[PDB]
Structure 1
């Protein structure tokens, strides 16, 4: 997260770190056994780390639970990042309390202008590289589809939305991928892609979760 702020330990209780020896992507816990992340975060041997703040220090609220299965969206296209969503099932149910909590799926798509919270342990620099150890947060509005499409001609599908700031300076970034965009207490987005980070007229592009709720629910129901 570039231009964000330190969330505060366990203030984003649904935020998970996907760990394969190191943090490589975010995710969002959507029930005790399931995490939603970006399909481009797919890899085998994922350990889901819940209850994280400092991902480099055991601070006492962590739950580390290996994935038992990952399900990449049936229509995920890695070239276009269309349908950049994947479900990860935990081998065991996370223990849910205030510091580790699922985030509600949307019942409706959020509109442009809705303020959201984007979070992650990704790079905090738009130029160069610095990875935070504690969870970073960014309040960012969903941008209009028109501004999104204008920013990224020929790339924004109906399964994507832009959020952030056209002026740049504030954005998610590498290492935030897969993580949440939560708006009014609903998971509306998944950190998906963008050109660089926090670049002018290159806002973050997010998987439009509301399109996937049916798939998520039915997948969970049968897996």
Structure 2
């Protein structure tokens, strides 16, 4: 997260990280046993960490749960990034408490102008490359599809939308992928891609979670 701030320590119980020897992506806890992430964050083996604030300093609230199933959307396209969404079933249900809890799926599509909260342990660009130990947060508005397509001619599919600032300076960045864009308590976006981070006229591009509610519900049910 570039140009953001440190999230309040306890405050985003739904934010998880994906690990495979090291932290490589984020994710969101949507039910006791299911996590939503990005398809480009797929690895054959993944350990999900929950309840983290500082990924290097344990405060006792942290859980370490292996992924039992890792399911990319069947229509994920690794070249165009169309349908960049993924589900992970935890090997055991998360223990629910103040530091580890779920976020709602969206009940309506993202509305332009709505202020959202984007979070993760991604590059902050604060001193050249800077991968922070503490979870970072960014308040940022949903942009119109017109603004999105103007920023990325040729590249914005139906699965995608932009959240951020056309002026640049504030954005998600590397290691943030798979993490949450939450708007009014609902998971509207998954951190996906962008041209650079925090460039002028190049806001982050996010997967539109609302388009996948049925797939998510069906997938979860098919894997009970």
TM-score (structure 2 length as normaliser):
0.98
Partner of 1:190: 190
- Rounded to whole Å, the distance in 2 between the matches of 1:3 and 1:129 is 13
Partner of 2:6: 6
- Rounded to whole Å, the distance in 2 between the matches of 1:210 and 1:52 is 26
Does residue 147 (structure 1) correspond to residue 122 (structure 2)? The answer is: no
- Rounded to whole Å, the distance in 2 between the matches of 1:169 and 1:78 is 27
* CA displacement at 1:127 relative to structure 2: 8.0
Does residue 138 (structure 1) correspond to residue 117 (structure 2)? The answer is: no
Secondary structure of the residue that 1:146 maps to in structure 2? helix
* CA displacement at 1:98 relative to structure 2: 1.9
Partner of 1:56: 56
Aligned residues: 223
* CA displacement at 1:126 relative to structure 2: 7.6
Instruction: Output the aligned Cα RMSD.
Output: 1.0
Secondary structure of the residue that 2:217 maps to in structure 1? helix
Does residue 118 (structure 1) correspond to residue 118 (structure 2)? The answer is: yes
Secondary structure of the residue that 1:100 maps to in structure 2? coil
Secondary structure of the residue that 2:30 maps to in structure 1? strand
Instruction: List gaps (5 residues or longer) in structure 1.
Output: none
Q: How does 1:1-223 map to 2 (within 5 A)?
A: 1-125=1-125, 128-223=128-223
Moved more, 121-130 or 201-210: 121-130
- Rounded to whole Å, the distance in 2 between the matches of 1:187 and 1:44 is 25
Instruction: List gaps (5 residues or longer) in structure 2.
Output: none
- Rounded to whole Å, the distance in 2 between the matches of 1:157 and 1:172 is 19
